[PDB]
Amino acid sequence: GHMIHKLADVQSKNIGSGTRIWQFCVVLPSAIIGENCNICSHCFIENDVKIGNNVTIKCGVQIWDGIEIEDDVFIGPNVTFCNDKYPRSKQYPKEFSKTIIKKGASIGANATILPGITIGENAMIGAGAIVTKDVLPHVTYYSKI
Amino acid sequence: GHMIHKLADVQSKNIGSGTRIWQFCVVLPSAIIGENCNICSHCFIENDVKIGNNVTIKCGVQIWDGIEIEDDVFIGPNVTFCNDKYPRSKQYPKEFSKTIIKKGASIGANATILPGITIGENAMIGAGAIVTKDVLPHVTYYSKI
Amino acid sequence: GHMIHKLADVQSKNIGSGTRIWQFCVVLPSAIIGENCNICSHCFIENDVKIGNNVTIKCGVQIWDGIEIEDDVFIGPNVTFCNDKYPRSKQYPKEFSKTIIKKGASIGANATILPGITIGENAMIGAGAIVTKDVLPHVTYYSKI
Ligand SMILES: CC(C)(COP(=O)(O)OP(=O)(O)OC[C@H]1O[C@@H](n2cnc3c(N)ncnc32)[C@H](O)[C@@H]1OP(=O)(O)O)[C@@H](O)C(=O)NCCC(=O)NCCS
Ligand SMILES: CC(C)(COP(=O)(O)OP(=O)(O)OC[C@H]1O[C@@H](n2cnc3c(N)ncnc32)[C@H](O)[C@@H]1OP(=O)(O)O)[C@@H](O)C(=O)NCCC(=O)NCCS
Ligand SMILES: CC(C)(COP(=O)(O)OP(=O)(O)OC[C@H]1O[C@@H](n2cnc3c(N)ncnc32)[C@H](O)[C@@H]1OP(=O)(O)O)[C@@H](O)C(=O)NCCC(=O)NCCS
Ligand SMILES: Cc1cn([C@H]2C[C@H](O)[C@@H](COP(=O)(O)OP(=O)(O)O[C@H]3O[C@H](C)[C@@H](O)[C@H](N)[C@H]3O)O2)c(=O)[nH]c1=O
Numbered sequence: 001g002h003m004i005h006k007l008a009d010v011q012s013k014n015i016g017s018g019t020r021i022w023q024f025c026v027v028l029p030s031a032i033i034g035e036n037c038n039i040c041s042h043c044f045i046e047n048d049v050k051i052g053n054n055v056t057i058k059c060g061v062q063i064w065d066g067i068e069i070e071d072d073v074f075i076g077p078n079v080t081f082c083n084d085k086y087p088r089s090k091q092y093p094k095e096f097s098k099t100i101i102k103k104g105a106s107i108g109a110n111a112t113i114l115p116g117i118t119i120g121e122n123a124m125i126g127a128g129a130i131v132t133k134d135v136l137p138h139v140t141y142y143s144k145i
Numbered sequence: 146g147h148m149i150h151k152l153a154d155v156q157s158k159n160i161g162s163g164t165r166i167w168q169f170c171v172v173l174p175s176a177i178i179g180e181n182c183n184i185c186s187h188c189f190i191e192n193d194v195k196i197g198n199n200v201t202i203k204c205g206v207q208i209w210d211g212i213e214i215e216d217d218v219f220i221g222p223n224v225t226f227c228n229d230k231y232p233r234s235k236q237y238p239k240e241f242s243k244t245i246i247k248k249g250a251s252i253g254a255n256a257t258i259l260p261g262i263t264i265g266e267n268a269m270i271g272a273g274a275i276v277t278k279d280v281l282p283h284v285t286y287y288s289k290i
Numbered sequence: 291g292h293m294i295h296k297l298a299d300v301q302s303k304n305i306g307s308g309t310r311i312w313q314f315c316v317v318l319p320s321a322i323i324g325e326n327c328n329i330c331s332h333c334f335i336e337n338d339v340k341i342g343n344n345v346t347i348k349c350g351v352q353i354w355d356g357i358e359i360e361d362d363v364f365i366g367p368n369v370t371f372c373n374d375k376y377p378r379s380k381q382y383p384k385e386f387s388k389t390i391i392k393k394g395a396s397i398g399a400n401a402t403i404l405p406g407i408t409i410g411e412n413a414m415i416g417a418g419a420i421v422t423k424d425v426l427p428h429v430t431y432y433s434k435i
């Protein structure tokens with residue numbers, strides 16, 4: 001009982017009941033997605049990826065290898081994640097940096113999350129923020145304009 | 146006399162003459178789009194949405210419920226809008242916050258527009274800006290780097 | 291010997307051996323793309339565009355007319371480029387501003403590159419940065435948070 005749009009390319013069988021995956025999403029085979037998620041249009045979800053239950057991923061987000069999203073997380077549109085702190089074309093690290101977005105946290109629209117980051121339970125990341133350090137549980141963080 | 150790309154999912158009949166809607170766009174049924182718009186690839190346009198005439202929406206933009214775009218507006222690529230100031234997964238507000246981008250205004254590439262915002266007529270929003278307060282008509286606003 | 295995903299719209303024949311172009315990409319006819327590039331999902335590549343060899347373009351990037359990418363460049367996800375410094379809807383300039391990203395340079399996730407910019411060889415642009423001035427060769431530049 002999950003809904004995969006005919007215009008998505010979903011290669012993972014590991015998708016929970018109630019989850020919706022919308023148009024022009026790519027989901028690679030090893031991705032794990034929980035129950036009652038909403039994966040909005042134009043998202044990319046790689047292999048070494050775990051996403052919990054009741055997660056909302058708005059449009060235009062990519063979830064790279066090494067990223068874990070816990071239950072009840074909200075990820076705003078065009079939010080960007082990283083798994084490589086010093087990227088150079090065709091220079092593959094032995095191991096990708098890991099990011100974890102902990103239960104109930106929310107990431108505002110168009111925020112940028114550096115590699116290796118923990119965002120604590122129920123944190124709120126302001127729209128457009130750059131997150132270069134871990135954010136503590138329940139903290140509201142935004143970049144000064 | 147409007148052009149919907151075969152690789153778009155356009156569900157709205159409310160689309161003006163001369164409008165182009167490009168590959169991998171999603172446009173939901175209640176969306177209103179005026180004449181001679183250009184809705185570039187990879188855009189998402191929701192239901193409670195009004196877009197005027199001669200509007201340019203570059204690639205990778207989402208126009209959420211509660212957002213109105215007036216005539217002659219330019220929206221740069223990967224510009225992000227918001228309709229929920231304190232987003233939590235599966236916590237639906239009674240009413241979405243409204244944003245209006247007034248006639249002739251321009252929003253630079255990758256800008257972030259907070260919910261509830263008015264951008265005045267002929268304003269210019271710098272590339273990458275975070276807009277947390279209304280922008281007055283004809284004002285050039287950008288976030289200090 | 292190049293791989294074009296069946297869910298991409300690639301109109302250019304000017305694509306080097308070993309290049310991969312993934313789902314939901316648009317590549318217009320005059321685009322030039324070198325050998326062993328990886329053009330990830332959800333990218334847009336216009337006509338007056340030259341991209342060298344061994345270039346990585348992560349998801350959700352648009353490469354506009356007037357932009358040149360040299361060999362061995364890395365472009366992070368949701369990176370945004372510009373070819374028009376004072377955009378107004380339907381006001382087409384005689385000439386688009388040119389941007390060049392020089393050999394081996396890397397642009398972090400969700401960075402914004404203003405029009406007319408040179409990013410020098412082997413530079414590193416931090417995630418989320420706004421680049422309003424040329425970046426010198428081998429320099430690490432990021433926007434203060
Ligand atoms: C971070 C946020 C929760 C803060 O809301 P708040 O605590 O009510 O803060 P206020 O609106 O009272 O603003 C306090 C100050 O911080 C600034 N500020 C607020 N959000 C900001 C942001 N995202 N980036 C930068 N500055 C921000 C305001 O400009 C204000 O500055 P001032 O004191 O100089 O006037 C909210 O503004 C936000 O970014 N929400 C996320 C929206 C979103 O992305 N939704 C998902 C898509 S719908
Ligand atoms: C905002 C904008 C219109 C200002 O242009 P301008 O008034 O000619 O300003 P200048 O280039 O003279 O720059 C003035 C100062 O503001 C800074 N600045 C300009 N644009 C900025 C931006 N978007 N964000 C942050 N700082 C910016 C410059 O770095 C310069 O700083 P300095 O005085 O310390 O050297 C322009 O830079 C811009 O962002 N244009 C939008 C481009 C775009 O997104 N096009 C759509 C896609 S093609
Ligand atoms: C720019 C970058 C290379 C700098 O790494 P570094 O030189 O190791 O810098 P550090 O982590 O030691 O940070 C130095 C300081 O700059 C700040 N900083 C680092 N990167 C920043 C960024 N992108 N934006 C703003 N501030 C940043 C840190 O917060 C720190 O501030 P502090 O001294 O006040 O504590 C790196 O942080 C980065 O942005 N990498 C790109 C990641 C990416 O986009 N990958 C592609 C997708 S996988
Ligand atoms: C019909 C349809 C829907 N969608 C996605 C995008 C659309 O905004 C979303 C609607 O589902 P929802 O469950 O009503 O909304 P969601 O939980 O994703 O987000 C909404 O509610 C939260 C609470 C707000 O913060 C958010 N800003 C809202 O968009 O599903 C698509 O991507 N394609 C579609 O065709």
Ligand SMILES: Cc1cn([C@H]2C[C@H](O)[C@@H](COP(=O)(O)OP(=O)(O)O[C@H]3O[C@H](C)[C@@H](O)[C@H](N)[C@H]3O)O2)c(=O)[nH]c1=O
Pocket residue numbers: 167168183184185186201203316318336354372373374377378379380381382383
């Ligand atoms: C052929 C084709 C076009 N498009 C979109 C994306 C492409 O950049 C645009 C070209 O149409 P246009 O009317 O020539 O250009 P637009 O008005 O969108 O923007 C151009 O002009 C304005 C004035 C500049 O600020 C802007 N930076 C330019 O891109 O249409 C697509 O999305 N897919 C396509 O296949």
Ligand SMILES: Cc1cn([C@H]2C[C@H](O)[C@@H](COP(=O)(O)OP(=O)(O)O[C@H]3O[C@H](C)[C@@H](O)[C@H](N)[C@H]3O)O2)c(=O)[nH]c1=O
Pocket residue numbers: 026028046064082083084087088089090091092093312313328329330331346348
């Ligand atoms: C199978 C498949 C792959 N891709 C794209 C997106 C995916 O992340 C990438 C994998 O190819 P790669 O050559 O393994 O990785 P890439 O060089 O693009 O990037 C990886 O390595 C560099 C060194 C890191 O900085 C980067 N963060 C990594 O993603 O190819 C797609 O877009 N669709 C797909 O179906």
